Design a protein around this ligand. Structure first.
Ligand code: ATP
Ligand code: LAB
Ligand code: MG
Lengths: 360, 135
Protein backbone atom coordinates (compact mmCIF):
# COMPACT_ATOMS: atom_id res chain seq x y z
CA UNK A 1 0.00 0.00 0.00
CA UNK A 2 0.82 3.72 -0.55
CA UNK A 3 1.91 4.70 -4.00
CA UNK A 4 4.86 6.95 -4.73
CA UNK A 5 4.66 10.10 -6.99
CA UNK A 6 7.74 11.33 -8.76
CA UNK A 7 7.55 14.50 -10.94
CA UNK A 8 10.80 14.80 -12.90
CA UNK A 9 11.51 18.36 -14.21
CA UNK A 10 14.42 19.92 -16.00
CA UNK A 11 15.50 21.84 -12.88
CA UNK A 12 13.76 20.24 -9.91
CA UNK A 13 12.56 16.84 -8.81
CA UNK A 14 9.37 16.72 -6.81
CA UNK A 15 8.82 13.46 -5.02
CA UNK A 16 6.62 12.03 -2.32
CA UNK A 17 3.84 9.74 -1.29
CA UNK A 18 0.38 9.58 -2.87
CA UNK A 19 -2.28 11.16 -0.66
CA UNK A 20 0.13 13.74 0.83
CA UNK A 21 -0.72 17.40 0.13
CA UNK A 22 2.80 18.37 -0.83
CA UNK A 23 5.98 16.70 -2.08
CA UNK A 24 8.19 15.28 0.75
CA UNK A 25 11.33 16.01 -1.25
CA UNK A 26 12.10 18.82 -3.71
CA UNK A 27 15.73 18.79 -4.94
CA UNK A 28 17.86 19.82 -7.95
CA UNK A 29 17.82 17.54 -11.00
CA UNK A 30 21.59 17.37 -11.25
CA UNK A 31 24.08 14.49 -11.14
CA UNK A 32 27.82 14.97 -10.40
CA UNK A 33 30.64 12.55 -11.16
CA UNK A 34 34.29 12.88 -9.90
CA UNK A 35 36.63 15.11 -11.92
CA UNK A 36 38.86 12.96 -14.26
CA UNK A 37 28.25 9.69 -8.43
CA UNK A 38 26.26 12.16 -6.35
CA UNK A 39 22.74 13.54 -6.81
CA UNK A 40 20.91 16.78 -5.97
CA UNK A 41 21.91 18.95 -3.00
CA UNK A 42 24.90 16.66 -2.12
CA UNK A 43 26.15 16.93 -5.74
CA UNK A 44 25.92 20.70 -5.55
CA UNK A 45 27.72 20.69 -2.15
CA UNK A 46 30.63 18.76 -3.75
CA UNK A 47 30.65 20.73 -6.95
CA UNK A 48 34.36 21.64 -6.42
CA UNK A 49 35.29 17.94 -6.83
CA UNK A 50 32.63 16.99 -9.47
CA UNK A 51 31.40 17.62 -13.01
CA UNK A 52 27.63 18.44 -12.85
CA UNK A 53 25.07 17.67 -15.51
CA UNK A 54 21.31 18.05 -15.93
CA UNK A 55 19.86 14.79 -17.24
CA UNK A 56 16.60 16.36 -18.38
CA UNK A 57 16.71 19.05 -21.03
CA UNK A 58 13.58 21.06 -21.93
CA UNK A 59 11.45 18.38 -20.16
CA UNK A 60 12.85 15.45 -22.11
CA UNK A 61 15.11 12.89 -20.47
CA UNK A 62 18.42 13.00 -22.47
CA UNK A 63 20.96 11.28 -20.19
CA UNK A 64 19.61 7.94 -19.15
CA UNK A 65 22.45 6.71 -16.98
CA UNK A 66 22.28 9.94 -14.97
CA UNK A 67 18.48 9.80 -14.89
CA UNK A 68 18.80 6.30 -13.37
CA UNK A 69 20.98 7.79 -10.61
CA UNK A 70 18.27 10.43 -10.04
CA UNK A 71 15.59 7.69 -9.57
CA UNK A 72 17.86 5.59 -7.30
CA UNK A 73 18.60 8.65 -5.14
CA UNK A 74 14.87 9.50 -5.06
CA UNK A 75 13.83 6.13 -3.82
CA UNK A 76 16.68 5.24 -1.38
CA UNK A 77 17.93 8.60 -0.08
CA UNK A 78 14.99 10.96 -0.41
CA UNK A 79 11.87 8.83 0.20
CA UNK A 80 13.66 5.95 2.05
CA UNK A 81 11.71 3.13 0.40
CA UNK A 82 12.33 -0.05 -1.44
CA UNK A 83 10.87 0.57 -4.93
CA UNK A 84 9.73 -3.00 -5.28
CA UNK A 85 7.18 -2.41 -2.51
CA UNK A 86 5.22 0.55 -4.03
CA UNK A 87 3.36 1.45 -7.21
CA UNK A 88 5.17 4.44 -8.71
CA UNK A 89 3.47 7.19 -10.71
CA UNK A 90 5.89 9.16 -12.89
CA UNK A 91 5.34 12.20 -15.08
CA UNK A 92 6.34 13.23 -18.59
CA UNK A 93 6.27 16.08 -20.97
CA UNK A 94 3.59 16.58 -23.64
CA UNK A 95 4.78 14.92 -26.88
CA UNK A 96 7.38 12.73 -25.16
CA UNK A 97 8.78 10.29 -27.78
CA UNK A 98 7.46 6.70 -27.81
CA UNK A 99 10.98 5.41 -27.16
CA UNK A 100 11.45 7.69 -24.09
CA UNK A 101 8.28 6.41 -22.48
CA UNK A 102 9.22 2.80 -23.17
CA UNK A 103 12.66 3.33 -21.70
CA UNK A 104 11.17 4.84 -18.53
CA UNK A 105 8.89 1.79 -18.24
CA UNK A 106 11.78 -0.63 -18.92
CA UNK A 107 13.97 1.00 -16.23
CA UNK A 108 11.20 1.03 -13.59
CA UNK A 109 10.30 -2.63 -13.97
CA UNK A 110 13.73 -4.17 -14.86
CA UNK A 111 16.10 -2.04 -12.74
CA UNK A 112 13.88 -0.83 -9.88
CA UNK A 113 11.58 -3.89 -9.98
CA UNK A 114 8.49 -1.80 -9.12
CA UNK A 115 5.27 -3.82 -8.74
CA UNK A 116 3.25 -1.28 -10.74
CA UNK A 117 3.69 2.07 -12.42
CA UNK A 118 2.03 4.70 -14.52
CA UNK A 119 3.24 7.71 -16.54
CA UNK A 120 0.94 10.82 -16.73
CA UNK A 121 1.33 13.99 -18.73
CA UNK A 122 2.43 16.93 -16.50
CA UNK A 123 -0.14 19.44 -17.67
CA UNK A 124 -2.98 16.85 -17.37
CA UNK A 125 -1.97 16.43 -13.67
CA UNK A 126 -1.84 20.20 -13.04
CA UNK A 127 -5.24 20.64 -14.59
CA UNK A 128 -6.59 17.85 -12.40
CA UNK A 129 -5.10 19.43 -9.24
CA UNK A 130 -7.31 22.45 -9.86
CA UNK A 131 -10.35 20.12 -10.00
CA UNK A 132 -10.69 20.15 -13.83
CA UNK A 133 -10.63 17.59 -16.61
CA UNK A 134 -11.18 20.25 -19.38
CA UNK A 135 -9.12 23.41 -19.87
CA UNK A 136 -5.94 24.74 -21.42
CA UNK A 137 -2.81 24.72 -19.30
CA UNK A 138 0.18 27.02 -19.61
CA UNK A 139 2.88 24.88 -17.93
CA UNK A 140 6.14 26.87 -17.57
CA UNK A 141 9.05 25.55 -15.57
CA UNK A 142 12.92 25.82 -15.69
CA UNK A 143 13.56 24.36 -19.13
CA UNK A 144 10.35 24.35 -21.25
CA UNK A 145 7.02 26.05 -21.69
CA UNK A 146 3.91 24.34 -23.09
CA UNK A 147 0.38 25.17 -24.06
CA UNK A 148 -1.71 22.00 -23.52
CA UNK A 149 -5.44 22.02 -24.34
CA UNK A 150 -7.25 19.16 -22.72
CA UNK A 151 -10.82 17.84 -23.06
CA UNK A 152 -12.13 15.28 -20.55
CA UNK A 153 -8.58 14.24 -19.72
CA UNK A 154 -7.40 13.86 -23.39
CA UNK A 155 -4.63 16.13 -24.57
CA UNK A 156 -6.10 17.39 -27.87
CA UNK A 157 -4.71 16.25 -31.29
CA UNK A 158 -2.14 18.46 -32.87
CA UNK A 159 -2.82 21.37 -30.60
CA UNK A 160 0.07 21.26 -28.11
CA UNK A 161 2.60 24.05 -28.47
CA UNK A 162 6.12 23.68 -27.05
CA UNK A 163 8.42 26.66 -26.45
CA UNK A 164 12.07 26.32 -25.28
CA UNK A 165 12.04 29.51 -23.28
CA UNK A 166 11.48 29.13 -19.53
CA UNK A 167 12.93 30.05 -16.15
CA UNK A 168 16.56 29.27 -16.84
CA UNK A 169 16.49 31.42 -19.97
CA UNK A 170 14.90 34.20 -17.96
CA UNK A 171 17.64 34.04 -15.32
CA UNK A 172 20.28 34.26 -18.09
CA UNK A 173 18.57 37.30 -19.62
CA UNK A 174 18.39 39.00 -16.22
CA UNK A 175 22.15 38.36 -15.81
CA UNK A 176 22.74 40.03 -19.21
CA UNK A 177 20.56 43.07 -18.52
CA UNK A 178 21.98 43.60 -15.02
CA UNK A 179 25.45 43.46 -16.68
CA UNK A 180 24.24 46.22 -19.03
CA UNK A 181 23.31 48.28 -15.84
CA UNK A 182 26.95 48.04 -14.56
CA UNK A 183 27.00 44.91 -12.37
CA UNK A 184 28.74 41.68 -13.46
CA UNK A 185 26.92 38.31 -13.35
CA UNK A 186 28.54 35.60 -15.48
CA UNK A 187 29.51 32.51 -13.48
CA UNK A 188 27.31 29.53 -12.51
CA UNK A 189 27.35 30.78 -8.97
CA UNK A 190 26.43 34.27 -10.17
CA UNK A 191 23.61 32.64 -12.13
CA UNK A 192 22.16 31.25 -8.87
CA UNK A 193 22.26 34.61 -7.17
CA UNK A 194 20.46 36.11 -10.19
CA UNK A 195 17.82 33.27 -10.03
CA UNK A 196 17.12 34.33 -6.44
CA UNK A 197 16.83 38.03 -7.49
CA UNK A 198 14.36 37.02 -10.24
CA UNK A 199 12.21 34.96 -7.87
CA UNK A 200 12.08 37.75 -5.24
CA UNK A 201 11.85 40.98 -7.19
CA UNK A 202 10.61 40.34 -10.73
CA UNK A 203 7.04 40.88 -11.99
CA UNK A 204 5.02 41.10 -15.16
CA UNK A 205 3.89 44.55 -16.28
CA UNK A 206 0.19 45.00 -17.05
CA UNK A 207 1.24 47.52 -19.73
CA UNK A 208 4.91 47.18 -20.59
CA UNK A 209 5.42 50.47 -22.47
CA UNK A 210 3.57 52.40 -19.70
CA UNK A 211 5.73 50.69 -17.08
CA UNK A 212 8.92 51.54 -19.02
CA UNK A 213 7.85 55.23 -18.83
CA UNK A 214 7.27 55.16 -15.05
CA UNK A 215 10.73 53.52 -14.57
CA UNK A 216 12.55 56.10 -16.67
CA UNK A 217 10.81 59.08 -14.96
CA UNK A 218 11.04 58.06 -11.25
CA UNK A 219 12.55 55.63 -8.73
CA UNK A 220 9.11 54.34 -7.33
CA UNK A 221 9.81 50.88 -8.95
CA UNK A 222 13.40 50.47 -7.76
CA UNK A 223 14.27 47.78 -5.21
CA UNK A 224 17.46 46.93 -3.38
CA UNK A 225 19.08 43.51 -3.00
CA UNK A 226 22.11 42.51 -0.87
CA UNK A 227 24.58 40.16 -2.57
CA UNK A 228 26.44 37.38 -0.68
CA UNK A 229 29.66 39.47 -0.68
CA UNK A 230 27.79 42.33 1.10
CA UNK A 231 27.33 44.62 -1.88
CA UNK A 232 23.83 46.15 -2.16
CA UNK A 233 22.49 46.55 -5.70
CA UNK A 234 19.55 48.47 -7.13
CA UNK A 235 17.22 46.93 -9.74
CA UNK A 236 14.68 49.06 -11.67
CA UNK A 237 13.02 48.22 -14.99
CA UNK A 238 14.89 44.88 -15.13
CA UNK A 239 12.29 43.64 -12.57
CA UNK A 240 9.70 43.52 -15.37
CA UNK A 241 11.83 43.47 -18.50
CA UNK A 242 13.07 40.00 -17.49
CA UNK A 243 9.63 38.20 -17.53
CA UNK A 244 8.43 40.41 -20.44
CA UNK A 245 10.44 37.94 -22.52
CA UNK A 246 7.68 35.35 -22.12
CA UNK A 247 5.44 37.77 -24.01
CA UNK A 248 8.18 39.07 -26.38
CA UNK A 249 10.65 36.27 -27.01
CA UNK A 250 12.53 38.63 -29.40
CA UNK A 251 14.12 40.12 -26.25
CA UNK A 252 16.41 37.02 -26.30
CA UNK A 253 16.53 36.68 -30.08
CA UNK A 254 13.82 34.00 -30.43
CA UNK A 255 11.46 34.26 -33.46
CA UNK A 256 8.52 32.70 -31.48
CA UNK A 257 5.22 34.23 -30.63
CA UNK A 258 4.83 35.03 -26.92
CA UNK A 259 2.91 32.80 -24.52
CA UNK A 260 -0.28 34.77 -25.03
CA UNK A 261 -0.23 34.13 -28.77
CA UNK A 262 0.83 30.52 -28.40
CA UNK A 263 -2.20 30.12 -26.08
CA UNK A 264 -4.40 31.52 -28.77
CA UNK A 265 -2.83 29.44 -31.50
CA UNK A 266 -3.35 26.29 -29.41
CA UNK A 267 -6.98 27.06 -28.82
CA UNK A 268 -7.37 27.73 -32.57
CA UNK A 269 -6.12 24.19 -33.32
CA UNK A 270 -9.07 22.84 -31.32
CA UNK A 271 -12.65 22.27 -32.39
CA UNK A 272 -15.00 25.21 -32.37
CA UNK A 273 -17.30 23.38 -29.96
CA UNK A 274 -14.75 23.25 -27.20
CA UNK A 275 -12.91 26.52 -27.46
CA UNK A 276 -15.23 28.40 -25.04
CA UNK A 277 -14.33 25.86 -22.29
CA UNK A 278 -10.65 26.38 -22.98
CA UNK A 279 -10.91 30.18 -22.77
CA UNK A 280 -12.91 29.91 -19.56
CA UNK A 281 -10.35 27.43 -17.97
CA UNK A 282 -6.79 28.70 -18.58
CA UNK A 283 -4.79 27.12 -15.69
CA UNK A 284 -1.21 28.16 -15.07
CA UNK A 285 1.23 25.49 -13.78
CA UNK A 286 5.01 25.64 -13.03
CA UNK A 287 7.60 27.88 -11.26
CA UNK A 288 7.81 30.39 -14.10
CA UNK A 289 4.13 31.16 -13.79
CA UNK A 290 4.87 32.61 -10.24
CA UNK A 291 5.62 36.23 -11.27
CA UNK A 292 3.21 38.71 -9.71
CA UNK A 293 0.99 40.17 -12.42
CA UNK A 294 1.17 37.27 -14.81
CA UNK A 295 -2.50 36.18 -14.64
CA UNK A 296 -3.83 39.71 -15.16
CA UNK A 297 -1.44 40.27 -18.10
CA UNK A 298 -2.46 37.02 -19.68
CA UNK A 299 -6.14 37.95 -19.12
CA UNK A 300 -5.57 41.24 -20.97
CA UNK A 301 -3.68 39.74 -23.95
CA UNK A 302 -6.07 36.85 -24.45
CA UNK A 303 -9.06 39.22 -24.33
CA UNK A 304 -7.39 41.25 -27.16
CA UNK A 305 -7.00 38.08 -29.30
CA UNK A 306 -10.19 36.23 -28.59
CA UNK A 307 -13.64 36.95 -30.17
CA UNK A 308 -15.04 40.12 -28.47
CA UNK A 309 -17.76 38.47 -26.36
CA UNK A 310 -15.67 35.42 -25.29
CA UNK A 311 -15.68 34.69 -21.55
CA UNK A 312 -12.11 34.34 -20.29
CA UNK A 313 -10.70 33.17 -16.99
CA UNK A 314 -7.10 32.67 -15.91
CA UNK A 315 -6.66 30.36 -12.92
CA UNK A 316 -3.35 30.66 -11.06
CA UNK A 317 -3.46 28.42 -8.02
CA UNK A 318 -1.37 29.50 -5.00
CA UNK A 319 0.24 25.97 -4.92
CA UNK A 320 1.12 25.93 -8.70
CA UNK A 321 4.80 25.40 -8.19
CA UNK A 322 3.91 21.88 -7.23
CA UNK A 323 0.43 21.37 -8.90
CA UNK A 324 1.81 18.66 -11.24
CA UNK A 325 2.94 16.62 -8.24
CA UNK A 326 -0.25 17.38 -6.31
CA UNK A 327 -2.40 16.20 -9.20
CA UNK A 328 -0.36 13.06 -9.26
CA UNK A 329 -0.82 12.55 -5.47
CA UNK A 330 -4.58 12.94 -5.79
CA UNK A 331 -4.81 10.68 -8.84
CA UNK A 332 -2.56 7.85 -7.53
CA UNK A 333 -4.50 7.81 -4.23
CA UNK A 334 -7.91 7.35 -5.85
CA UNK A 335 -9.69 3.98 -5.43
CA UNK A 336 -10.82 4.17 -9.12
CA UNK A 337 -7.27 4.58 -10.44
CA UNK A 338 -6.09 1.30 -8.94
CA UNK A 339 -7.01 -0.66 -12.09
CA UNK A 340 -5.08 1.81 -14.28
CA UNK A 341 -1.58 0.93 -13.11
CA UNK A 342 0.67 -1.13 -15.38
CA UNK A 343 1.32 -4.31 -13.37
CA UNK A 344 4.59 -6.32 -13.37
CA UNK A 345 2.52 -9.17 -14.84
CA UNK A 346 1.32 -6.98 -17.72
CA UNK A 347 4.88 -5.78 -18.36
CA UNK A 348 6.22 -9.40 -18.32
CA UNK A 349 3.68 -10.41 -20.96
CA UNK A 350 3.94 -7.35 -23.28
CA UNK A 351 7.32 -5.67 -22.62
CA UNK A 352 7.95 -1.84 -22.63
CA UNK A 353 5.26 -1.18 -25.27
CA UNK A 354 2.56 -1.89 -22.65
CA UNK A 355 2.92 1.83 -21.68
CA UNK A 356 1.17 3.00 -24.91
CA UNK A 357 -1.77 0.68 -24.11
CA UNK A 358 -2.14 1.73 -20.53
CA UNK A 359 -0.96 5.35 -20.16
CA UNK A 360 -3.21 7.25 -22.29
CA UNK B 1 -14.56 -6.19 -51.05
CA UNK B 2 -17.68 -8.42 -50.64
CA UNK B 3 -18.91 -9.43 -47.19
CA UNK B 4 -17.98 -12.95 -46.08
CA UNK B 5 -18.72 -15.34 -43.29
CA UNK B 6 -14.99 -15.16 -42.36
CA UNK B 7 -15.60 -11.39 -41.64
CA UNK B 8 -18.93 -12.14 -39.92
CA UNK B 9 -17.10 -14.47 -37.49
CA UNK B 10 -14.39 -11.98 -36.59
CA UNK B 11 -17.12 -9.44 -35.82
CA UNK B 12 -19.09 -12.05 -33.78
CA UNK B 13 -15.91 -12.63 -31.81
CA UNK B 14 -15.25 -8.89 -31.20
CA UNK B 15 -18.79 -8.18 -30.05
CA UNK B 16 -18.53 -10.99 -27.46
CA UNK B 17 -15.05 -9.90 -26.37
CA UNK B 18 -15.95 -6.25 -25.95
CA UNK B 19 -19.26 -5.90 -24.04
CA UNK B 20 -19.25 -2.13 -24.61
CA UNK B 21 -18.94 -2.32 -28.38
CA UNK B 22 -22.56 -1.32 -29.10
CA UNK B 23 -22.25 -0.98 -32.81
CA UNK B 24 -19.83 -1.99 -35.64
CA UNK B 25 -19.20 -0.90 -39.22
CA UNK B 26 -16.54 -1.90 -41.74
CA UNK B 27 -15.52 0.41 -44.56
CA UNK B 28 -13.46 -1.22 -47.39
CA UNK B 29 -10.44 0.57 -48.99
CA UNK B 30 -12.72 1.88 -51.72
CA UNK B 31 -14.70 3.65 -49.02
CA UNK B 32 -17.81 1.53 -49.45
CA UNK B 33 -19.59 -0.13 -46.51
CA UNK B 34 -18.86 -3.85 -46.31
CA UNK B 35 -21.10 -4.52 -43.30
CA UNK B 36 -22.56 -2.89 -40.24
CA UNK B 37 -24.59 -4.08 -37.24
CA UNK B 38 -28.39 -3.73 -37.51
CA UNK B 39 -28.59 -1.40 -34.48
CA UNK B 40 -27.09 1.57 -36.41
CA UNK B 41 -26.45 3.00 -39.82
CA UNK B 42 -23.42 5.07 -40.94
CA UNK B 43 -24.55 5.15 -44.64
CA UNK B 44 -25.51 8.80 -44.80
CA UNK B 45 -22.23 9.92 -43.21
CA UNK B 46 -19.84 8.00 -45.40
CA UNK B 47 -18.60 11.01 -47.45
CA UNK B 48 -17.34 12.82 -44.33
CA UNK B 49 -15.96 9.58 -42.81
CA UNK B 50 -13.97 8.93 -45.97
CA UNK B 51 -12.74 12.49 -46.09
CA UNK B 52 -11.46 12.06 -42.60
CA UNK B 53 -9.76 8.67 -43.35
CA UNK B 54 -8.09 10.15 -46.47
CA UNK B 55 -6.99 13.37 -44.71
CA UNK B 56 -3.35 14.60 -45.06
CA UNK B 57 -2.44 17.25 -42.44
CA UNK B 58 -0.80 20.44 -43.83
CA UNK B 59 0.58 23.18 -39.34
CA UNK B 60 -2.99 23.89 -40.36
CA UNK B 61 -5.92 22.66 -38.25
CA UNK B 62 -7.56 19.56 -39.79
CA UNK B 63 -10.84 17.81 -39.11
CA UNK B 64 -11.59 18.00 -35.36
CA UNK B 65 -15.17 16.67 -35.25
CA UNK B 66 -17.38 14.35 -37.19
CA UNK B 67 -21.08 13.39 -37.17
CA UNK B 68 -22.55 9.86 -37.58
CA UNK B 69 -26.34 9.38 -37.60
CA UNK B 70 -27.01 12.81 -36.07
CA UNK B 71 -24.57 12.49 -33.16
CA UNK B 72 -21.63 14.92 -33.34
CA UNK B 73 -18.30 13.68 -32.07
CA UNK B 74 -15.19 15.74 -31.00
CA UNK B 75 -12.03 14.02 -32.18
CA UNK B 76 -9.87 13.58 -29.05
CA UNK B 77 -7.24 11.09 -30.35
CA UNK B 78 -5.96 10.92 -33.95
CA UNK B 79 -3.13 8.57 -35.00
CA UNK B 80 -2.68 6.21 -37.91
CA UNK B 81 -3.68 3.39 -35.58
CA UNK B 82 -6.77 4.86 -33.89
CA UNK B 83 -9.05 7.89 -33.92
CA UNK B 84 -11.43 8.46 -30.96
CA UNK B 85 -14.56 10.69 -31.15
CA UNK B 86 -16.62 11.59 -28.12
CA UNK B 87 -19.95 13.45 -28.01
CA UNK B 88 -19.89 16.47 -25.69
CA UNK B 89 -23.38 15.76 -24.21
CA UNK B 90 -23.13 12.01 -23.26
CA UNK B 91 -24.56 10.45 -26.48
CA UNK B 92 -21.64 8.00 -26.89
CA UNK B 93 -18.19 7.58 -28.44
CA UNK B 94 -16.66 6.17 -31.63
CA UNK B 95 -13.35 4.44 -32.26
CA UNK B 96 -12.13 4.39 -35.89
CA UNK B 97 -9.21 2.03 -36.63
CA UNK B 98 -7.81 2.43 -40.14
CA UNK B 99 -7.14 -0.73 -42.15
CA UNK B 100 -4.29 -1.03 -43.00
CA UNK B 101 -2.52 1.27 -40.48
CA UNK B 102 -2.98 4.81 -41.79
CA UNK B 103 -5.07 3.51 -44.67
CA UNK B 104 -8.51 4.04 -46.14
CA UNK B 105 -10.43 0.98 -44.83
CA UNK B 106 -11.66 1.02 -41.27
CA UNK B 107 -13.19 -0.86 -38.43
CA UNK B 108 -15.49 1.56 -36.61
CA UNK B 109 -16.88 0.83 -33.15
CA UNK B 110 -19.71 2.67 -31.44
CA UNK B 111 -19.06 2.61 -27.72
CA UNK B 112 -21.61 2.54 -24.88
CA UNK B 113 -21.85 6.11 -23.50
CA UNK B 114 -21.59 4.64 -19.91
CA UNK B 115 -18.19 3.11 -20.77
CA UNK B 116 -14.88 4.71 -21.72
CA UNK B 117 -13.46 4.41 -25.23
CA UNK B 118 -9.97 3.98 -23.70
CA UNK B 119 -10.98 0.52 -22.53
CA UNK B 120 -11.96 -0.82 -25.97
CA UNK B 121 -8.99 0.47 -28.01
CA UNK B 122 -6.75 -2.49 -27.58
CA UNK B 123 -9.17 -5.08 -28.87
CA UNK B 124 -10.60 -2.90 -31.66
CA UNK B 125 -7.08 -2.21 -32.87
CA UNK B 126 -6.18 -5.93 -32.85
CA UNK B 127 -9.41 -6.78 -34.64
CA UNK B 128 -8.77 -4.13 -37.29
CA UNK B 129 -5.48 -5.97 -37.99
CA UNK B 130 -7.29 -9.28 -38.27
CA UNK B 131 -9.40 -7.80 -41.08
CA UNK B 132 -6.47 -6.46 -43.14
CA UNK B 133 -6.35 -9.14 -45.82
CA UNK B 134 -10.23 -9.66 -45.93
CA UNK B 135 -10.68 -6.48 -46.66
N1 ATP C 1 8.53 33.11 -7.43
C1 ATP C 1 9.10 32.81 -8.61
N2 ATP C 1 9.15 33.71 -9.57
C2 ATP C 1 9.69 33.43 -10.76
N3 ATP C 1 10.21 32.22 -11.06
C3 ATP C 1 10.22 31.24 -10.17
C4 ATP C 1 9.64 31.47 -8.88
N4 ATP C 1 9.80 30.33 -8.20
C5 ATP C 1 10.42 29.45 -9.03
N5 ATP C 1 10.70 30.02 -10.18
C6 ATP C 1 11.39 29.40 -11.33
O1 ATP C 1 10.74 28.22 -11.71
C7 ATP C 1 11.67 27.28 -12.23
C8 ATP C 1 11.39 25.98 -11.60
O2 ATP C 1 10.04 25.57 -11.81
P1 ATP C 1 9.59 24.03 -11.94
O3 ATP C 1 9.92 23.12 -10.80
O4 ATP C 1 8.14 24.25 -12.29
O5 ATP C 1 10.42 23.61 -13.28
P2 ATP C 1 10.89 22.13 -13.68
O6 ATP C 1 9.70 21.13 -13.45
O7 ATP C 1 12.22 21.85 -12.97
O8 ATP C 1 11.15 22.44 -15.22
P3 ATP C 1 10.48 22.02 -16.69
O9 ATP C 1 9.00 21.93 -16.27
O10 ATP C 1 10.79 23.21 -17.55
O11 ATP C 1 11.09 20.71 -17.09
C9 ATP C 1 13.05 27.91 -11.96
O12 ATP C 1 13.45 28.54 -13.20
C10 ATP C 1 12.81 28.97 -10.92
O13 ATP C 1 13.80 30.09 -10.91
C1 LAB D 1 17.07 26.28 -4.76
C2 LAB D 1 17.12 25.70 -6.16
C3 LAB D 1 16.24 26.22 -7.05
C4 LAB D 1 16.09 25.83 -8.46
O1 LAB D 1 15.10 26.11 -9.10
O2 LAB D 1 17.06 25.02 -9.09
C5 LAB D 1 16.98 24.49 -10.37
C6 LAB D 1 18.10 23.43 -10.39
C7 LAB D 1 19.46 24.19 -10.35
C8 LAB D 1 20.61 23.25 -10.31
C9 LAB D 1 21.87 24.05 -9.98
C10 LAB D 1 21.90 24.77 -8.65
C11 LAB D 1 23.33 25.36 -8.48
C12 LAB D 1 21.59 23.92 -7.46
C13 LAB D 1 20.64 24.09 -6.54
C14 LAB D 1 19.58 25.20 -6.51
C15 LAB D 1 18.17 24.64 -6.46
O3 LAB D 1 19.56 24.95 -11.53
C16 LAB D 1 18.66 26.07 -11.62
O4 LAB D 1 19.00 27.02 -10.61
C17 LAB D 1 18.83 26.73 -12.98
C18 LAB D 1 20.13 27.57 -13.12
S1 LAB D 1 19.70 29.30 -12.95
C19 LAB D 1 18.03 28.96 -13.26
O5 LAB D 1 17.19 29.85 -13.31
N1 LAB D 1 17.77 27.63 -13.31
C20 LAB D 1 17.18 25.59 -11.40
MG1 MG E 1 7.89 20.57 -14.77
Amino acid sequence: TTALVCDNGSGLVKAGFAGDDAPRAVFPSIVGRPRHSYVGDEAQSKRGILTLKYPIEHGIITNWDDMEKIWHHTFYNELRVAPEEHPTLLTEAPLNPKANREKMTQIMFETFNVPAMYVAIQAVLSLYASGRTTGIVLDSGDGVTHNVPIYEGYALPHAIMRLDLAGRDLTDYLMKILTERGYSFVTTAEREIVRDIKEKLCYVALDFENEMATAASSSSLEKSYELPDGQVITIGNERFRCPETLFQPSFIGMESAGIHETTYNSIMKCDIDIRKDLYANNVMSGGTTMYPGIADRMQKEITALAPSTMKIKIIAPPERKYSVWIGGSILASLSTFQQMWITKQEYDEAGPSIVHRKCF
Amino acid sequence: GPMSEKIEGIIDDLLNLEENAHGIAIIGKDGKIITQTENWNISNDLDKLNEFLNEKLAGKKGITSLSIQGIKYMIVENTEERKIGTNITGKGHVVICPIPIGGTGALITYVNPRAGPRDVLFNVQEYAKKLTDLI
